[PDB]
Design a protein around this ligand. Sequence first.
Ligand SMILES: [Mg+2]
Ligand SMILES: [Mg+2]
Ligand SMILES: [Mg+2]
Ligand SMILES: [Mg+2]
Ligand SMILES: [Mg+2]
Ligand SMILES: [Mg+2]
Ligand SMILES: [Mg+2]
Ligand SMILES: [Mg+2]
Ligand SMILES: [Mg+2]
Ligand SMILES: [Mg+2]
Ligand SMILES: [Mg+2]
Ligand SMILES: [Mg+2]
Ligand SMILES: [Mg+2]
Ligand SMILES: [Mg+2]
Ligand SMILES: [Mg+2]
Ligand SMILES: [Mg+2]
Ligand SMILES: [Mg+2]
Ligand SMILES: [Mg+2]
Ligand SMILES: [Mg+2]
Ligand SMILES: [Mg+2]
Ligand SMILES: [Mg+2]
Ligand SMILES: [Mg+2]
Ligand SMILES: [Mg+2]
Ligand SMILES: [Mg+2]
Ligand SMILES: [Mg+2]
Lengths: 31, 100, 121, 78, 93
Amino acid sequence: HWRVMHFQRQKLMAITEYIPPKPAINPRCLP
Amino acid sequence: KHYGIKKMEGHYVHAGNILGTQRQFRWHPGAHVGLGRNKCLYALEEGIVRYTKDVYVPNPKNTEAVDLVTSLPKGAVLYKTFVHVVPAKPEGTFKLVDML
Amino acid sequence: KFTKSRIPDKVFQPKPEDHEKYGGDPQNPHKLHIVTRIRSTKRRPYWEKDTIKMLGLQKAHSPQIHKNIPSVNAKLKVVKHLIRIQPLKLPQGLPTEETMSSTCLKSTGELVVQWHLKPVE
Amino acid sequence: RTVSFQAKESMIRRLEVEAENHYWLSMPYMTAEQECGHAAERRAQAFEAIKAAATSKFPKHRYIADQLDHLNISKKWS
Amino acid sequence: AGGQWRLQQGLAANPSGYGPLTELPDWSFADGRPAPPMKGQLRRKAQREKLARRVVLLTQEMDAGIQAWKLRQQKLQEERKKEHDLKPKGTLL
RNA sequence: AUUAAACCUUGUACCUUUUGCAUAAUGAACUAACUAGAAAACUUCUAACUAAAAGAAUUACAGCUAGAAACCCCGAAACCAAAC
RNA sequence: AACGAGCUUGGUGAUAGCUGGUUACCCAAAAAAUGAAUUUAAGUUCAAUUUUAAACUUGCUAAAAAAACAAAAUCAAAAAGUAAGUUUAGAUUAUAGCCAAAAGAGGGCUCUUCUGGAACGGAAAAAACCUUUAAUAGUGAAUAAUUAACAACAUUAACCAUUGUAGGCCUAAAAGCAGCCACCAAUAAAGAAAGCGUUCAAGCUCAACAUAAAAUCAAAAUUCCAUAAUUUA
RNA sequence: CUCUUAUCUUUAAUCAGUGAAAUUGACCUUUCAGUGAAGAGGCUGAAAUAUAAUAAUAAGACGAGAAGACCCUAUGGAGCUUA
RNA sequence: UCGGAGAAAAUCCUCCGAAUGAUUAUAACCUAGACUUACAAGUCAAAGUAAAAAUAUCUUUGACCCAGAUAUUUUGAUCAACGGACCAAGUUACCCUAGGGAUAAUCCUAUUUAAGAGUUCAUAUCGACAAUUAGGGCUCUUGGAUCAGGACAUCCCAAUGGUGUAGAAGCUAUUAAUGGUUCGUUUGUUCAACGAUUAAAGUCCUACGUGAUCUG
Ligand SMILES: [Mg+2]
Ligand SMILES: [Mg+2]
Ligand SMILES: [Mg+2]
Ligand SMILES: [Mg+2]
Ligand SMILES: [Mg+2]
Ligand SMILES: [Mg+2]
Ligand SMILES: [Mg+2]
Ligand SMILES: [Mg+2]
Ligand SMILES: [Mg+2]
Ligand SMILES: [Mg+2]
Ligand SMILES: [Mg+2]
Ligand SMILES: [Mg+2]
Ligand SMILES: [Mg+2]
Ligand SMILES: [Mg+2]
Ligand SMILES: [Mg+2]
Ligand SMILES: [Mg+2]
Ligand SMILES: [Mg+2]
Ligand SMILES: [Mg+2]
Ligand SMILES: [Mg+2]
Ligand SMILES: [Mg+2]
Ligand SMILES: [Mg+2]
Ligand SMILES: [Mg+2]
Ligand SMILES: [Mg+2]
Ligand SMILES: [Mg+2]
Ligand SMILES: [Mg+2]
């Protein structure tokens, strides 16, 4: 059981999640 | 009850005002400050209160302090907290009373 | 216990990229702030309620002019989340006694001293 | 719960505004010492106005005209 | 609708703010005589003049306070370099 | 609101009591009449005369005299005296 | 007709810290429901709060160092943003709160401490969460909060097997395999064997021989319950 | 009682005459799931639905009248017994 | 009632003590300014004057009224329910009025793990240590009759997989709510038992389902 988070706190977590950068070309399809 | 510092450092104090209450000697009388039988501290002059550290030397007659003091190492000596009041007025001035 | 908090000093030390983005030279700093309230003081601690009344920001969306001096800035930091700050700008110079009755403030932050309500042509 | 798209964007827009607020508060025109005393004269005058209003209370004048005008209630065409 | 675009062009977000549509008079007599000023416009004019006068007052105090400080700086500076009397030496002074 | 009475849209009866909350719980079939805040020690306001005021007895180191200004209704189980 | 003590009149408008009720309009201000005593806790008095009037002068936010503390509450210079504060006179009511969010203490309750709230909009209905400076007329306008969100992958699959000897050991025997120490041998390539399985043995595999190829966590009890929908800047 | 049945009288129903009582905030007085103070005819979301009588059943309207009982309080009472 | 220690400024929180005693070379009168405190009570003290040749240290009780004592100054409370009525106990089911309420552990089921049971062989049948955002159940309202609505976690009837399944009997698991699910009786048994039967005599929810339908 996880104690529920105040909706304001829940909004904070959603906006600060990790975002990875993505390459333009996938390595496998490259020579 | 309510043991504590009645007058804090940097306050104008009149004669007779009580500065601190204590069950034991957390502070010691200094300049122009007296002792009450209950060990309260009051001001003997009109002026500003000050708290300062200073060296402690006991009366020769009392045994307990002398025994401890001599037993201290050569390097340093013990200290204590002292309370002082700085007088702020001239006790009097000369004025012309009569021309004879 | 929820209590008053102190912001770390680093927050208010800018970076070179910030100067480019917002277009302010770290020299020749501006003199007058334009401040507007864009949120509400209900459900906020009482210290924030009092400061908003000290700065004159009772009505929302009405601009107030203040000095860019340290004592004022100390108060603005307390209510930074409820207000918007824009630097004042005077393209045509400070208003004189002659032009005092023809000034008008634009949304950009420019206090023009002549207002004719005519096409620029 | 799942945070809706609207809620995430609206919060971001408010974050961006506050970021600019931090920047414009970092460049004080005058240092603390230069500020000291620069507005003393204006402040002192203001309190003098406040004190003057406080100590100005007193009753109001009374006039014979007000009392004697009550008689016009019985004016007529003779 | 269109608030953000209006601000980009430098106008007010609400078309009911400053501009010709709101500020200009709404009517005039058929002869050509001008109409009396609208009550809302008179209030708007007074508010702007009040704001402008504050701008003048605040700037002058800040400028007057910068010079007064540096003038004090000098007085301390010259006062520091001072001397008097004389400086003998040896077995009699 | 409407061209149009009803159709469409909006809207959790009233008083009292409870924790500023009621789909809680008291009270009300409806009409007419009847049915519940009262006193002047001190204070404030308005005048007369003033080291004095008051139509006898009282108060007074600006006082004293007069006016105006106030504090509810209904309801027990009981106790005692004398008759029947 | 109603006796744990008859009935009637009077004392009597008995008394009730308890229950119920207490009749026109408008404007203005405003509570907390903490501390102390009480045959007191269903009540009252005092402080504290609030408030009307009057006199006259500094208040609120902030607050350096330097203390006192132990290794954020006092204290309040000078400034700045700002309009309150003290003294005098009079007066009641109130003295049980509720939910959310923090920190503790006795172990879900129960206390103590700091902050916030009481929509006519929003979260499905919605006292306590979120947006919201008062209140007026208009068939104008710009905005705020706003239950929805877009099940796998990312060292092997092909062919095989000869021997010193069944290695010692009360174990009949315990042979690669019960142990128990050693653990070496030939051969291109073969562990005194990684498993099965045999009373022990046999027998089946693994690894070896050549021959090939691929390439970590995650998106229950009346009767289902808006309707629907994957791409137009 | 297994396991109930038949007949007659009283009641009941229709016609004629006379004519009460408790009760009653206003009612244009529906079902299911959800919400809620074990609780919804009236609130949220769905669904159903021409208008009125006569005779029957008793699930609900926390159905009506209960002088019906258990627990607590009051510096309210009364009867009895004493040391 | 008062004081000391912890919690730490809460408590019916954890502990100890007090209603004094010993020694005193005997500690006067008068008076600025302060602490503490709702009130009442309680603390400290400069200067001046006076005796002497300045403070006694140990360290904690009780108002007013009203009665005392003597030669003017003093003394009287386990009023301990400790802000203290000058002096009063039981009992009521024979009872009355005014009101306010009301009326984690355990344990079993299901998943994960797998030492040991099973002659041999972990998982036919079980199963330690554990794991389970797992389910659901010193004391002090229920039965029955009538009529039933519904869930599936299935007792019987039905379709299937495995077996330490030869046949016949059985043990275990999956799917499914179709209709049904008896009649009598108490000597002993802390919410039990007995006789005769049946294909079976299932487990539960519905304010004891149900008392304006009835009854113990
Ligand atoms: Mg009741
Ligand atoms: Mg009624
Ligand atoms: Mg009437
Ligand atoms: Mg009465
Ligand atoms: Mg409080
Ligand atoms: Mg008493
Ligand atoms: Mg009481
Ligand atoms: Mg200051
Ligand atoms: Mg008839
Ligand atoms: Mg209808
Ligand atoms: Mg329902
Ligand atoms: Mg409905
Ligand atoms: Mg019914
Ligand atoms: Mg009937
Ligand atoms: Mg009833
Ligand atoms: Mg009492
Ligand atoms: Mg009595
Ligand atoms: Mg009595
Ligand atoms: Mg002395
Ligand atoms: Mg007592
Ligand atoms: Mg007492
Ligand atoms: Mg009996
Ligand atoms: Mg059934
Ligand atoms: Mg099943
Ligand atoms: Mg019933």
